[PDB]
């Protein structure tokens, strides 16, 4: 069983940049007849993956010029010269020497752009959800770069942890952002029993975490 | 025109079985192997086996050996795949591919792909619920507000605001998996609080299984 390991997960570049992605197997691809056992797949998201590269370094037909690869043993690469805006997408490298066949990671290709914190807002449960028997309390991460960000939710100044769901939106097509919705679940006698409700977002823009909240009965 | 085209997505319960199919033209089937693929929802891609079509000869990945079972018909151009006790943790897409051998190895074309959402849920329309602030505040620019997509079954919702009128700003986030089988996600909108009382925000969420539709004015 080959292991297939890529690097880095994710990749932050700009249109025109030279995008270089790596792929390391765990043993030679080198086969008998002197050709590499290596595949490069591309995938957007909802889609089936697309064959760029047969045998490491061979151009799939139908695949953009501005793609080549190479790469000796066991450390691969796949470059993409003149980025397009096309080539956001995931890209996953796999081996077909041995079986199983194993895959990567998947290393993805998102847009490059400013930092940029995020606007947090909080929302309480409303009184139609309470007059149901839950209650679930909401956290926005409005606009934001990178997408690295951590949600911390407080109740009566305790640290939450597996009540909480989070949901990031993909890439802004044109302001290259994220978004992201933490949703914190408590059942109505929970919450009854609690009064502030703190959403803590801790994120490379902000200088120190910032934390937004609400005093239960209070709105 | 070479194409492998697969059977509709499907719903299954847990401890059932579901038999994809991949259906091969413009070229030779019994020239070129089938794989079969699947990749989980926040998953990379993972290899299930392959099976010569002029043969019926199957490989399988040890984790997939019982479950999983390829079949072809040769007479029919047909690739199956079919994978037993389904859990929840089988839901996920797949794929076939068919892997070109003549002068080289390459896994040039894949078919579009099959959903298997593997649950024990029922169609259930969702419950809307308004995402606002505790209490309006004049002291920030642009103000938050949305509405909760809560509990209901399958995908998917498609929430609007205004009936369309108000575009710019909005972000719906992907649905999530609740324990209970069912989905629930949020839709928010951003606009200047500067306009908060003489301008109505109301969210048109839709979800066709259930045939319903809801608008829900917010604060």
């Known amino acids: 069983d080959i292991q297939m390991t890529q690097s880095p997960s994710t990749l932050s570049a700009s249109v025109g940049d030279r995008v270089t992605i790596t792929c390391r197997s765990s043993?030679?691809?080198?086969?008998?007849?002197?050709?590499?056992?290596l595949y490069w797949f591309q995938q957007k998201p909802g889609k089936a993956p697309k064959l760029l590269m047969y045998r490491m370094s061979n151009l799939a037909s139908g695949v953009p010029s501005r793609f080549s690869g190479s790469g000796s043993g066991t450390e691969f690469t796949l470059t993409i010269s003149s980025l397009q805006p096309d080539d956001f997408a995931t890209y996953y490298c796999?081996?077909?020497?041995?079986?199983?066949?194993?895959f990567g990671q998947g290393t993805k290709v998102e847009v490059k752009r400013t930092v940029a914190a995020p606007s947090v807002f909080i929302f309480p449960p409303s009184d139609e959800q309470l007059k149901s028997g839950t209650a679930s309390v909401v956290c926005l991460l409005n606009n934001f770069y990178p997408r690295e960000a951590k949600v911390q939710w407080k109740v009566d100044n305790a640290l939450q942890s597996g009540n909480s769901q989070e949901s990031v939106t993909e890439q802004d097509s044109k302001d290259s952002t994220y978004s992201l919705s933490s949703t914190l679940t408590l059942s109505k006698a929970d919450y009854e029993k609690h009064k502030v409700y703190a959403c803590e977002v801790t994120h490379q823009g902000l200088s120190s975490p910032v934390t937004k909240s609400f005093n239960r009965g209070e709105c | 025109e070479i194409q492998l085209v697969q059977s509709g997505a499907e719903v299954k319960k847990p401890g059932s079985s579901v038999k994809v199919s991949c259906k091969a033209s413009?070229?030779?089937?019994?020239?070129?192997?089938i794989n079969w693929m699947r990749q989980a929802p926040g998953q990379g891609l993972e290899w299930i086996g392959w099976i010569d079509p002029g043969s019926g000869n199957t490989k399988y990945n040890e984790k997939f050996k019982g479950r999983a079972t390829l079949t072809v018909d040769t007479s029919t151009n047909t690739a199956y795949m079919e994978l037993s006790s389904l859990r929840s943790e089988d839901t996920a897409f797949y794929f076939c591919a068919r892997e070109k051998t003549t002068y080289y190895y390459a896994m040039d074309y894949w078919g579009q792909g099959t959903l298997v959402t593997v649950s024990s849920a029922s169609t259930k329309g969702p419950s809307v619920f308004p995402l606002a602030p505790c209490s309006r505040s004049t002291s920030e620019s642009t103000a938050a507000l949305g509405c909760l997509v809560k509990d209901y079954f399958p995908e998917p919702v498609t929430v609007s605001w205004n009936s369309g009128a108000l575009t710019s700003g909005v972000h719906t986030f992907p649905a999530v998996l609740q324990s209970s089988g069912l989905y629930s996600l949020s839709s928010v909108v951003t606009v200047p609080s500067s306009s908060l009382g003489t301008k109505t925000y109301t969210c048109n969420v839709d979800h066709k299984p259930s045939n319903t539709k809801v608008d829900k004015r917010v604060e």
């Open positions: 413009g070229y030779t089937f019994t020239d070129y192997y």
């Open positions: 043993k030679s691809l080198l086969h008998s007849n002197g050709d590499t056992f």
């Open positions: 796999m081996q077909h020497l041995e079986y199983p066949f194993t």
